[PDB]
Design a protein around this ligand. Structure first.
Ligand code: SHA
Length: 167
């Protein structure tokens, strides 16, 4: 049994809810919240900008030190950093950004990072300002992630379309 409430069950392991991931993290304090990161961990807008704002910029400060030591992530890669006031840990995952021309086949590699964590609160990778089709992102998630994933969908209209169209 876990703390997550009000989710629709899509599969054995994938759950979905219309919710602001920031407000959901603040309520649940999950072991892992996933950030929709870029390779520079520059948390400017969307999931990354909203999560970072909720940490009062502490996520960005920690991220800048990580990049100064380790250099950029790979598209499809991830790193584990602090969850600050939102979660125990933040898994920063880089999905491909279609608005930069990145290979959408890298979306499966991105979701494979989730399998290193038994339970996660996450957004749909490569959705929103990353430019991918969120219906596709949800299909890759279901077909890739084997651990228990609680997906927060920021937009109500999109949430209803994701549920109604789910195979
Ligand atoms: O932009 C946002 N503002 O809150 C946001 C918040 C939660 C999830 C995705 C988002 O884009």
């Amino acid at each position: 049994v876990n703390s997550f409430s009000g989710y629709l069950k899509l599969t054995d392991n994938v759950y979905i809810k219309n919710a602001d991931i920031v407000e959901e993290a603040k309520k649940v304090k999950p072991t892992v919240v996933v950030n929709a990161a870029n390779v520079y961990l520059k948390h400017g807008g969307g999931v990354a900008g909203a999560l970072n704002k909720a940490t009062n910029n502490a996520m960005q400060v920690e991220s800048d030190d990580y990049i100064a030591t380790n250099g950029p992530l790979k598209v499809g890669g991830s790193c584990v950093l602090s969850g600050h006031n939102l979660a125990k840990h933040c898994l920063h995952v880089v999905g491909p950004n279609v608005n930069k021309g990145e290979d959408i086949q890298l979306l499966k590699s991105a979701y494979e990072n989730f399998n290193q964590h038994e339970v996660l609160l996450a957004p749909l990778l490569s959705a929103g300002i990353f430019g991918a089709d969120p219906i596709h992102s949800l299909r890759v998630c279901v077909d890739t992630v084997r651990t228990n994933v609680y997906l927060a969908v920021f937009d109500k209209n999109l949430y209803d379309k994701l549920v109604s169209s789910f195979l």
